[PDB]
Amino acid sequence: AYECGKQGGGALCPNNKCCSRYGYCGFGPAYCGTGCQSGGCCPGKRCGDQANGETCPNNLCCSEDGYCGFGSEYCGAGCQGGPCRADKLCGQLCPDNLCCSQWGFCGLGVEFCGDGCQSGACCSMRCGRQADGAKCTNNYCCGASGYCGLGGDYCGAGCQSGPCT
Amino acid sequence: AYECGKQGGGALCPNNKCCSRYGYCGFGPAYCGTGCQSGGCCPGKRCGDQANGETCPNNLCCSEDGYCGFGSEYCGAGCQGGPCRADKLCGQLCPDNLCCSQWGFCGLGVEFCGDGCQSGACCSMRCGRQADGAKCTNNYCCGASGYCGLGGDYCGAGCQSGPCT
Ligand SMILES: CC(=O)N[C@@H]1[C@@H](O)[C@H](O)[C@@H](CO)O[C@@H]1O
Numbered sequence: 080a081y082e083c084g085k086q087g088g089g090a091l092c093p094n095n096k097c098c099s100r101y102g103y104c105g106f107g108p109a110y111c112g113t114g115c116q117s118g119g120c121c122p123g124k125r126c127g128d129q130a131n132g133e134t135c136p137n138n139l140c141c142s143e144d145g146y147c148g149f150g151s152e153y154c155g156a157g158c159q160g161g162p163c164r165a166d167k168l169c170g171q172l173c174p175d176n177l178c179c180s181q182w183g184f185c186g187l188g189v190e191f192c193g194d195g196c197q198s199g200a201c202c203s204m205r206c207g208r209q210a211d212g213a214k215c216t217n218n219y220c221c222g223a224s225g226y227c228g229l230g231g232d233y234c235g236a237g238c239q240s241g242p243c244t
Numbered sequence: 245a246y247e248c249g250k251q252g253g254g255a256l257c258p259n260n261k262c263c264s265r266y267g268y269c270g271f272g273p274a275y276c277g278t279g280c281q282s283g284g285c286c287p288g289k290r291c292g293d294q295a296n297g298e299t300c301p302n303n304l305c306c307s308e309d310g311y312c313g314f315g316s317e318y319c320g321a322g323c324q325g326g327p328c329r330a331d332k333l334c335g336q337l338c339p340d341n342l343c344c345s346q347w348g349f350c351g352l353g354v355e356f357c358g359d360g361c362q363s364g365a366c367c368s369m370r371c372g373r374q375a376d377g378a379k380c381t382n383n384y385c386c387g388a389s390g391y392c393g394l395g396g397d398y399c400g401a402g403c404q405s406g407p408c409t
């Protein structure tokens with residue numbers, strides 16, 4: 080049974096484990112080297128302006144030079160994406176389903192996803208019949224009971240709008 | 245089949261999708277709310293000095309208050325884990341399999357994991373008979389051909405040292 084990557088339904092490995100070209104999790108050249116799909120690849124996966132705007136998997140930072148990693152060389156000056164040290168503006172959805180707060184910054188946690196959340200993975204956004212026909216942002220599904228989200232509970236039976244079924 | 249979490253062998257969802265209490269990926273309260281296992285949970289998972297030292301899944305930042313998220317509130321002042329904005333010294337392992345560079349900082353990518361990597365997910369750290377009996381760090385396995393790693397390719401057939409199976 081595959082664990083990760085294109086063989087494993089796009090799953091990631093935990094704790095920065097590399098997903099090999101064959102869809103298994105580990106560390107060392109066999110996993111992190113040629114063909115590495117995600118995790119702490121070496122070299123890092125290509126990203127940003129150097130790779131058609133692709134983001135890094137596992138919330139790695141995209142360096143100025145368009146490689147995925149962590150540390151100041153990746154997250155600091157010139158960082159193109161992921162958890163860059165610079166605040167990330169939005170209003171222009173946040174990458175990778177991050178919440179755009181009421182104040183126009185990207186993040187996760189209640190301060191971003193809770194009250195006033197504009198877009199991304201908001202805690203509770205109403206939609207459909209139950210909200211005057213409001214549509215979900217981010218091409219999320221409206222669930223049968225009028226909350227925005229993804230996965231079967233929202234896109235499955237009952238789904239009111241967005242990429243249902 | 246299960247996708248994530250305990251039920252899915254510890255896999256993470258892609259793109260910060262929440263892992264529900266039942267082991268499926270999505271967004272909205274059914275996935276991100278009570279019993280959320282990973283991803284952009286709301287509220288964030290507990291972490292650090294509020295979770296017996298457990299780090300956030302998916303490389304989220306652990307805030308001062310012990311919640312998982314992103315943004316300055318989480319990664320900035322008071323951050324106690326994940327990709328904090330502060331540099332992280334090592335020499336003392338890095339958390340979450342991060343590479344300890346030759347300069348004694350934690351990160352990922354070749355500047356950390358490549359030449360002079362001390363520990364963590366090093367690109368190509370030699371071990372075993374090929375390295376005159378050198379041990380791997382991090383309780384990694386030494387593979388048949390004398391590289392340090394984890395996963396079947398290193399801990400399986402031919403494993404020289406570490407927690408071979
Ligand atoms: C929830 C939210 O959007 N908070 C932001 C914070 O992340 C950002 O660092 C700050 C910059 O002035 O502005 C707000 O407080």
Ligand SMILES: CC(=O)N[C@@H]1[C@@H](O)[C@H](O)[C@@H](CO)O[C@@H]1O
Pocket residue numbers: 150151152331345346347348349350351355356
């Ligand atoms: C590869 C590496 O270890 N680089 C680190 C850098 O990440 C850190 O920000 C700096 C702090 O003084 O020390 C080194 O330059």
